[PDB]
Design a protein around this ligand. Structure first.
Ligand SMILES: Cc1ncc(COP(=O)(O)O)c(CN[C@@H]2CONC2=O)c1O
Ligand SMILES: Cc1ncc(COP(=O)(O)O)c(CN[C@@H]2CONC2=O)c1O
Lengths: 414, 414
């Protein structure tokens, strides 16, 4: 309980505004997170003081920019407890990292009869690349079933993963159900069958500590915009032995060693996978966001989100005619639906009260079909959210219920 | 002569500092450009006021973020005079856009016997993707020769481009020679042979007006970091008819329409080519940079750079023992070498005087071999550079010459 939430909110300028005459209640951090002054001012200092191209050491500003970029790389490495900076690749985001794994590893290690195994709860970023890969290779795509509470059983994993499985791609935390998947056990299961494991950690990395050596994941993808960092930057971690054998996904400057007229050689890791001028300011700002989160403490943030999630689940259960999807033990988010009220109208009415939630399919259409719903609403939490905001949310949901019941038969009166 | 260079420099905070006790003289804008307060404060306002995920219209901040992102897209469209926003794709940069063309178009439209034609002056971003593409397809890569002054003759283009040529990939402006290539005539030549034309416009877009309908280019790539915009964002323009027939290079959320267990359909253009959460802040800042440059006027910037280039060429010709590469008519940059002084030491001594130039191969190794040199130095200009800075550069080069001649035989005295 070391965390002071008021002192934390004081660092986020975007929280201190009104929307439609009501104080802003931002409950959409699973879509994207807000940034503290540390990150924004890091970007400001970069553009104001030492912006330059990196990886030359020719003049002073170039050296400072290179130092910032590679220091951010080292910050990421220690943040996820990677063994080496050669295993940390800066990308455009989680989606780009997963696509890089699918292109450079899957399309080069899959033959007919091979299996890529995913789950029904995966976001589209962890579905479409594997579809395209197994189509290009003639392999087979399989799905791990889910329990009725939206979790995955280890025996179902042992059943789905076979000796023909080469890749197991799975989410660390589901942005819809809030489920925390048994990533370590699934990694051991995949390794027992001769498969590698790809972990979509876009929703886990911002909210809980990531120990890549303890999870024993082979690949791990994360996005900066979800963890108080700048947009347009993410990280691909891969085991160094795997990344050494993968060919680059992109080609150009900065990633080459020798360039002939028709053939070229690549740089060593990690620069082999970073073509062109890198995302310098964004990566430095992601390093700043890592410093911010680590100064607060990821275990603290996770405990705060557990408090928020338990409180929100209890208060949602106090509402009649509201369905919540997912297990009891969950990350800091609640996906739900109002009886006889479309989630889009729920979100509209909530925004009229200054409350920002999500309505739609959440980039998980097969999961929506598994849930037997067309769309849902979702309120997601982060380190700057409070129980009073959850009270505002549940009161607004009760008032939305009452208003849509009033409008209902007031023109049945007609 | 409407441009006031002092008023322009006042908007760039990074220019007003000292390096090694000397006022900063940034002459490395071909590597990356510096940013005015408008762009940095655009990023600040985004992160402070309306950061949210885009393309939902669910709550107020999300709507404002979506409006900013798509308005930046429209700004780009009008900036390069594209017909439609469906032809404007936000990417990581010029390199990523060229790789997307090579993956989605080249690898799907090349068979044995087909030709991809490039030039000897191309940067690595416009070389390696075509190498990999013609290798994957079994096609043939050809090179347009260069004149002795570093320019390209149209007859050499008509000779190299044949009826078997499917793609002609060429730079608009060379970041080494300063050559402005005849892009319109080469586009007509390529179309006469049944080929499309890909234009690397990373070095042209920041410094001269781009009329995509007048150039009749089929693809056009540009980078934001070179044109006063944020790092990590660029643009791929493609003719809408070509982009409609190309499959996506990346797969994930935001670019899908329907998602089944094994098959999926894509969004309409341009979102078909934008997977995952986009580079929201970076794209909005690129739009701000476009507003800034257009308020100044691209023709004005180009005239200023022509003045700077003519002045620099004349003052370089006043120095003995200095070789300049490229034609007389050129963009705002000078690539050179000192006699008996390695360009790395030139750049070091210049940085000791606060002067930031480039030393190395400039991501153009085949051009360096064509120039019969291992490395060169380069001073590149932009809208915030002055003739006094060029005077400082030439005086520092003369002093470097004198110092390295003094050190030479002062230990021959030994
Ligand atoms: C003509 C040209 N094409 C492509 C690029 C690379 O585009 P991105 O890095 O934005 O993807 C550059 C910039 N390359 C500079 C030139 O000098 N050193 C550089 O890194 C360039 O000048
Ligand atoms: C579990 C998960 N995987 C992948 C992604 C996408 O990663 P990038 O967009 O950074 O590449 C998200 C964020 N997707 C959010 C979830 O809700 N709506 C979104 O757009 C996610 O929550």
């Amino acid at each position: 309980g070391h965390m002071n939430i008021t002192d934390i909110r004081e660092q986020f300028p975007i929280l201190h505004q009104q929307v439609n005459g009501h104080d802003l209640v931002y409950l959409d951090s699973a879509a994207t997170s807000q940034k503290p002054r540390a990150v924004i001012e890091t970007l400001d200092k970069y553009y104001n003081q030492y912006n330059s191209n990196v990886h030359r050491g020719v003049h002073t500003l170039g050296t400072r920019a290179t130092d910032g970029y590679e220091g951010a790389r080292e910050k990421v490495r220690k943040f996820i407890n990677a063994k080496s900076m050669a295993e940390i690749i800066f990308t455009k985001g989680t989606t780009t990292s997963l696509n890089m794994v699918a292109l450079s590893y899957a399309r080069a290690n899959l033959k007919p009869g091979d299996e890529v195994v995913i789950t029904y709860m995966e976001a589209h970023a962890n579905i479409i690349p594997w579809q395209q890969a197994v189509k290009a290779t003639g392999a087979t795509l399989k799905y791990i079933p889910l329990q009725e509470d939206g979790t995955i059983s280890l025996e179902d994993v042992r059943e789905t993963v076979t000796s023909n499985t080469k890749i197991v791609a799975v989410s660390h935390v589901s942005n819809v159900l809030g489920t925390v998947n048994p990533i370590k056990e699934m990694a051991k299961i995949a390794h027992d069958n001769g498969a590698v494991i790809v972990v979509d950690g876009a929703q886990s990395t911002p909210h809980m500590k990531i120990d890549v050596q303890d999870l024993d994941c082979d690949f791990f993808a994360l996005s900066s915009h979800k963890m108080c960092g700048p947009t347009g930057v993410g990280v691909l971690y891969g085991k160094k032995a795997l990344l050494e054998n993968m060919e680059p996904a992109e080609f150009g400057g900065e990633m080459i060693d020798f360039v002939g007229l028709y053939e070229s050689t690549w740089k060593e890791l990690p620069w082999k996978f970073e073509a062109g001028t890198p995302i310098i300011a964004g990566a430095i700002g992601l390093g700043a966001a890592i410093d911010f989160l680590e100064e607060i403490g990821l275990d603290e943030i996770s405990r705060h989100e557990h408090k928020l999630a338990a409180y929100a689940l209890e208060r949602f259960r106090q509402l009649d005619g509201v369905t919540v999807y997912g297990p009891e033990e969950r990350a800091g988010l609640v996906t739900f639906n109002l009886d006889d009220v479309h989630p889009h109208d729920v979100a509209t009415v909530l925004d009229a009260e200054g409350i920002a939630v999500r309505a739609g399919h959440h980039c998980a259409q097969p999961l929506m079909k598994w849930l037997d719903v067309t769309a849902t609403a979702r309120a997601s939490f982060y380190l700057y959210n409070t129980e009073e905001e959850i009270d505002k949310l549940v009161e607004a949901l009760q008032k939305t219920k009452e208003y849509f019941t009033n409008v209902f038969v007031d023109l049945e009166h007609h």
